[PDB]
């Protein structure tokens with residue numbers, strides 16, 4: 001009902017009051033809280049006296065910590081080569097606007113951009129590629145011969161596959177980061193355009209270099225050092241010069257410059273623990289204007305009145321990008337560190353750029369003469385996010401109603417960056433780490449001074465609940481300094497902690513591994529579940545005959561002799577639950593591949609898959625709890641469904657089903673005397689069979705050959721630099737606390753009085769070191785069958801915020817490079 005925005009200056013106050021008067025969003029009232037600086041506004045948000053503000057991407061990390069504890073919620077989205085159904089989304093967004101006479105993207109029946117796009121109110125038409133980018137020079141005015149638009153849509157990777165080394169592409173057609181040559185066994189990494197990355201080509205039999213995912217994005221901004229043409233100094237002569245900065249906490253005015261200085265060995269500075277960066281910079285420059293600095297010389301050149309001088313606020317006339325440009329223009333500084341947005345063609349006569357390679361270049365070369373790319377700012381609020389919904393509603397309705405959000409006659413870059421075109425809601429999962437990305441996050445953590453000093457002799461294990469925390473505390477108090485404990489809410493949180501340098505290793509089931517291997521983490525060890533052979537456990541050199549891995553199979557009755565694998569469309573199938581590997585993922589994947597129609601909701605008959613839609617076919621014949629007529633629990637992902645779990649999926653084939661997708665164990669687990677005292681009382685394993693992939697059948701004990709696929713074992717993973725350490729400690733900690741450990745009377749790794757299946761599955765026999773084989777790391781963990789079956793041997797089969805945080809954003813002018 002109310003949204004309080006925090007303004008840092010009188011000009012932001014004036015613009016905010018203008019928006020209060022003019023912008024009329026229903027059921028939401030805008031209120032303007034005035035503070036004197038950026039930090040004061042962050043504190044006001046932390047105190048609850050304000051609700052939202054806009055921060056430079058450099059301030060997000062320090063915003064996420066004490067004494068602020070803020071999270072980004074609303075950011076400007078960037079166009080990339082990963083956008084799917086872009087035309088439909090842009091057309092919907094344009095139609096949602098409350099205006100008349102604006103470009104509404106015209107799509108075709110399939111949702112693709114029409115080659116010719118027109119603006120009805122103006123009559124101007126132009127040609128456009130598959131991503132909606134105007135072909136240069138094709139804009140035709142009304143009454144003029146339109147440019148004949150071709151269909152520029154063929155991806156460059158698929159164009160290289162034709163006319164043919166045959167590179168691999170994904171389903172959309174983009175370049176796979178890992179490239180494997182078939183004629184010559186070579187593995188290498190490629191850019192977002194297939195351009196080979198230097199230093200990644202590996203001969204065969206050698207382990208391949210881990211390739212990172214790349215996303216080609218457009219309209220990037222950069223941190224640049226503007227300098228007047230009348231001056232003559234270069235970059236390594238910055239010491240003693242007078243400087244203007246946009247802000248002490250902005251990336252375009254401080255952080256990027258500090259990084260470049262320390263990398264070029266230009267800044268005399270020990271470390272963030274030995275000396276603050278402001279001291280080194282105050283000793284580096286003579287007199288400067290750096291709004292927010294706590295050194296007198298770094299504020300001598302600022303032009304703010306008493307009380308307003310050197311504040312992170314437009315009250316200081318030299319604050320911001322345009323403030324730094326004004327400080328340079330009025331000869332109060334020799335160089336101005338700002339963003340590429342402040343550049344203009346009206347300045348290409350007096351000013352020029354200052355490149356870190358000790359050369360000078362015109363402004364138009366900012367893409368090849370800068371201190372680094374600067375991500376867009378973000379609207380942040382409290383980490384508790386009590387007002388995110390209201391702030392988002394207000395901002396979205398203000399954007400739909402064409403309110404003057406990103407412009408003002410009072411000044412530039414007030415409230416938001418004037419270069420901002422559109423604000424979008426970020427996933428509630430996104431914090432500072434996910435927003436900035438792993439590499440930028442670690443850079444900020446190192447610059448602030450929070451960089452964790454690694455210990456090669458202590459492993460920080462991550463727990464996902466309180467019972468695992470108690471077992472880890474036991475293990476740590478008994479380990480003798482070799483084991484420490486960190487807490488997270490879920491395994492993906494543990495992966496994020498490991499990527500943030502806050503944890504060291506974690507056990508992940510297979511359903512979490514694709515993300516982990518995507519973010520660079522490698523399997524340190526694999527769980528060994530072979531209950532019959534302790535060979536590899538007693539002596540690590542012993543070869544693993546079988547890891548005790550579960551084999552997904554399709555169990556059928558010996559009575560039904562028509563159920564074949566080529567005859568699984570229809571019938572009545574059985575699933576252990578939605579999400580489970582053997583009872584859902586493997587069959588759904590095999591079916592979606594072999595049947596190109598690929599609609600499971602209509603593929604089976606009255607299938608029972610707990611977790612689907614209660615009205616769909618995948619929820620019939622699921623008798624939900626026999627003796628509880630006071631509630632309806634059919635198709636529940638819990639024990640309240642008598643069809644959930646392996647036992648329920650087997651009871652499905654017993655009672656009303658024709659085929660049940662289960663691990664191979666259930667057949668022996670609910671049969672042959674070793675079976676419950678109810679429905680499976682006189683059932684025999686000889687009355688059942690398995691469905692093989694070639695369309696035949698076989699006895700149950702043939703699960704190693706007549707299987708749908710194999711399930712990889714749970715993997716304890718860590719960062720690469722830590723593998724040699726982690727394994728080591730693990731090995732030692734097994735010899736003391738394994739199943740045959742020397743001190744097994746003091747602690748067991750695979751058991752606990754605090755619970756069951758904590759840290760590791762209690763059925764785990766031991767932990768076997770991962771044998772890094774010279775192939776694709778996902779091909780080496782999942783294995784070719786599982787990799788191609790679930791993820792199609794593709795680095796693009798899944799998308800999430802964490803994968804986006806581990807993706808390198810390759811800047812480019814446009815996607816026309818195809």
Ligand SMILES: *NC1=N[C@@]23[C@@H](N1)[C@H](COC(N)=O)N=C(N*)N2CCC3(O)O
Nearest residue numbers: 526544547712713771772773780781783
């Ligand atoms: N390097 C390696 N990869 C394997 C095996 N060794 C190891 C043994 O697993 C077995 N035999 O089941 N463990 C795993 N998880 N993998 C992944 C694929 C593989 O069998 O090659």
